Amino acid sequence: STGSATTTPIDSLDDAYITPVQIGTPAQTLNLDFDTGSSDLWVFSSETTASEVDGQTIYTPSKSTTAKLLSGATWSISYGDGSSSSGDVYTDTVSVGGLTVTGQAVESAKKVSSSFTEDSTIDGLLGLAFSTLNTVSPTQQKTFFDNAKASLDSPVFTADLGYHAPGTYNFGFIDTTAYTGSITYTAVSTKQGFWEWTSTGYAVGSGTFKSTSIDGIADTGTTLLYLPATVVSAYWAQVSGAKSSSSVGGYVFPCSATLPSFTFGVGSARIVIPGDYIDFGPISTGSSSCFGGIQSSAGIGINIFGDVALKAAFVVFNGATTPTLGFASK
Template identity: 50%
Template sequence: MHRTLALLLVALLATVALAAPTAKQATTNTLKKRSFTIPRIRKTGYIRKPSEAMGRAYRKFGWSMTTPDGSPWVAVSKTPTTINLHANTSAPSNTTSSDQSIATNDRHLSDLRSWLYATFSWGYETPAASSAVAAPSTQATYAAASSAAHSSAVASSAAVSYAAYSSAATSFTVTTSAAAAATATPAPADAAPAPDYAAPAPSADGNDETGEVLATPADNGAEYLSPVTIGGQKLDLNFDTGSSDLWVFSTALTSAQIGEHSAYDPSKSSSYQQLDGSTFSLSYGDGSGAAGVVGFDTVDIGGATVTRQAIELATSVSSAFVSDADSDGLVGLAFSTLNSVSPRPQKTFFDNIMSELAQPVFTAALDLDGSGTYEFGTIDSSKFTGDLQFTPVNASSGFWQVDSNRYSIGGKDCDRTNASPAIIDTGTSLLLLDPEVVQAYYADIPSASYDSTVGGYTYDCSESLPEFAVAVGDYMANIPGSGITFAPVSTKTCFGGVQSNSGSDLQIFGDVLLKHHFVVFNGQSEVIGMAAKAE
């Protein structure tokens, strides 16, 4: 009897032990790149919030959101406004959504934006210039100097006009992953001189540098982060071709602001030097932003190194940046004319290292599976199919700005004569287009409508979506129908990655488009190259 009870007890304990849940561990694997192995960590289970993506993009460019009829976007707290694209009239009708409980958080955020719009008109205005307070040059007084940075304003800097692109003067070397060739095109003789930036220290490696880092999707693809080493400290930064500041979370922030971020500590870097009297301030139309002091340090991106790179150390950040726990800051890769450092703008990492690279280029090959990369100084032919097609860039805007005068829906082309110029922006999640293009696309989707609770177009997740393509110069950059959806709003409703720019004067070609293509940014010839990404 006792033996039987003992056996039953042992069996019971074994069953409980086997059924007990094991601790969750990060899913890891490795990506073999050339002669070395890079660890990769994937995050799972995060559902992207469409309102966050829309808000982030609109904050960045200081835009005011509007509904399809042109009126300011005002969130509806109970019954979302929808625009029926398939009826004879475009007048909004109020409907009750079955997804209200799931969209509650989005509506709270929408209400906040509505209040900001009503109170502040949600418009971007460059602050009036003010004298920057000189910061002591020693590391010991770095924190004391940080408080002076909050009152600094963004210094306005005139955009530099460059010589017109000439295809005859442009040459590129496409390399395999085995080696990099160095054929750089000389700058045009009539090119305008560069602004008077502080000069970086030259690289000791000559003009054959290359660098490569993984672009790991965070928040299920809402942004892509890459490891950057600054003064020996590793940070995960968002590479942003739509801005020109390299700014990071710093130890001068409060512990609450730092939270889960990795923060750069200048006192732990033997190569850090404060840039006396310089500050930075990035402010957006909804009140979010970052401000701080400026210094120099060694920055290494996958082997491409600048030994005296201007870095902007945040001493104050808004809650919007604090809540993005994955990103420790940004690497701006637009043209240096957009840099916000005052009183003297600084060069971007790419502008500083471009003359030291094997080729004056960097490339983006983004991928949701975590195998995407950014590369500096080389064009890897194994990452795209077909031929690269190059398009001249209007660098005077400060952006990688191109013409886009055509789009295609389900294989049907439509030419445009009044299209807004477009910028290639790896720092924006969505594809933001002129309103008439967006309305034309969703008119082909029976269940599509404009939903005021998320500020964009939604549709039944069961829909079979048409392919979409948009011109980058003469190159038609396509998105398969399966790649249009950005995120689910609920179990039945999905939010499209193609959304309106609310009639602004720029179209933004973000990651929803770019992750399907291999993109070359040539800073010397000022051209963009694109081809279909290899699968």
């Protein structure tokens, strides 16, 4: 089997991407944030504290003839950005782009943090990291991909995120029309539960390539590109007036600037992030200070190849017995 679904930016900055997901019988369609940096499929629901729901579409398990309470199971997750959610668990039928999993754990939120409430466009998350990170207790549950894997034509999914435009998540096949040149594959460590890999270096604009190993995670659920402070300083030093602002929480730059591109290495291959992908716009409405899309990972504890990086590539998440990651230009 295969599946193919369009993923759409939630706003004009590509702050996140939502993908429609069918849950239950009859289908209830929720728009979920596909997150290769976590492993829980959780939704706003009829159980979510009413004051914490503000415009989201909810899953109502009592209206699904295939929903079953997973008795005694609870979940609770905290994300790198400080947001969180928790609740109980149902199993139900879940379909993405025509690919159906029966008995998928659907984690129903009883509580969500303010950041989730305040984002009316995201109805929940669909985790695509390794199932070892799933938070369900006392019986850990599998991700949608893990459940689908054996049935797929090939044990892969691909992320093709758009810049200020829709893109595609495919399951079970590689669309050879969706990228240019060849796909370069690189090793993955699953030791921390992430799609963790090592970039071979970077360049700023038309500058020379610096060969250096940068361990990090391919994370569709993180907006920005978080890299070591040395790398980030080298980038922003090429933008007149750019500075790290403790009050704003990262590098800012004059909105009048033209940003240089940023290149990262995948083996001997190179992915180029155009400068415009690194512009996250005014820090507040009407400001002439703009927020940068490349930020320091110092104090996160891990480098994160978030959407800024991934949207410059066609990305293969290869879930074969030994997982790997593939990157192509597009």
